[PDB]
């Protein structure tokens, strides 16, 4: 009975089940709440030296690897989800993308219009909702759905 996008997992350290979505890589313990025309999201982009375009107004040499803008990703998400960080002050501080001044507003969009794994996330995802780490072209993104 499970939404598509959902599977249950084990907590490996605890034993309790937990819910995973293998679309937005988002976890959590509660069973989720069992398609519109556009969303609007916010992200937070972590670049790395395999990104499409290695550079942001951060920084003109991105030389990060893969797996540290993975665990800067992972610490904000725990950060955000303690409660002792906002998303918006850290895409704000810390996103390598230009959308950093606007707080990591994207504004809407339809399908057809970003790359595929942010798109499919953004979708996936329920008003309000964060996604985990997802993947592109253009490095790791934490994605919020706004609307
Ligand atoms: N700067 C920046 C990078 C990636 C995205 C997501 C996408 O292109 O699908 C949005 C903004
Ligand atoms: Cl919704």
Redesign the pocket.
């Known amino acids: 009975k499970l939404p598509p996008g959902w599977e249950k997992a084990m907590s490996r350290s605890s034993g309790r089940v937990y819910y995973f979505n293998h679309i937005t890589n988002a976890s959590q313990w509660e069973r989720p709440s069992g398609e519109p025309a556009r969303v609007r999201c916010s992200?937070l982009?972590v670049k790395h030296s395999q990104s499409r375009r290695p550079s942001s107004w951060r920084q003109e040499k991105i030389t990060r690897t893969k797996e540290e803008a993975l665990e800067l990703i992972n610490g904000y998400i725990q950060k955000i989800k303690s409660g002792e960080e906002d998303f918006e002050s850290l895409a704000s501080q810390f996103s390598?993308?230009?959308?950093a001044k606007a707080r990591g507003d994207?504004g809407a969009f339809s399908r057809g219009?970003?790359?595929?794994?942010?798109?499919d996330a953004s979708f996936a995802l329920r008003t309000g909702e964060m996604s985990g780490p997802v993947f592109?072209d253009?490095?790791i993104?934490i994605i919020l759905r706004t609307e």
């Open positions: 992200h982009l390598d993308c230009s959308s994207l219009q970003m790359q595929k794994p942010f798109e592109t253009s490095g993104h």
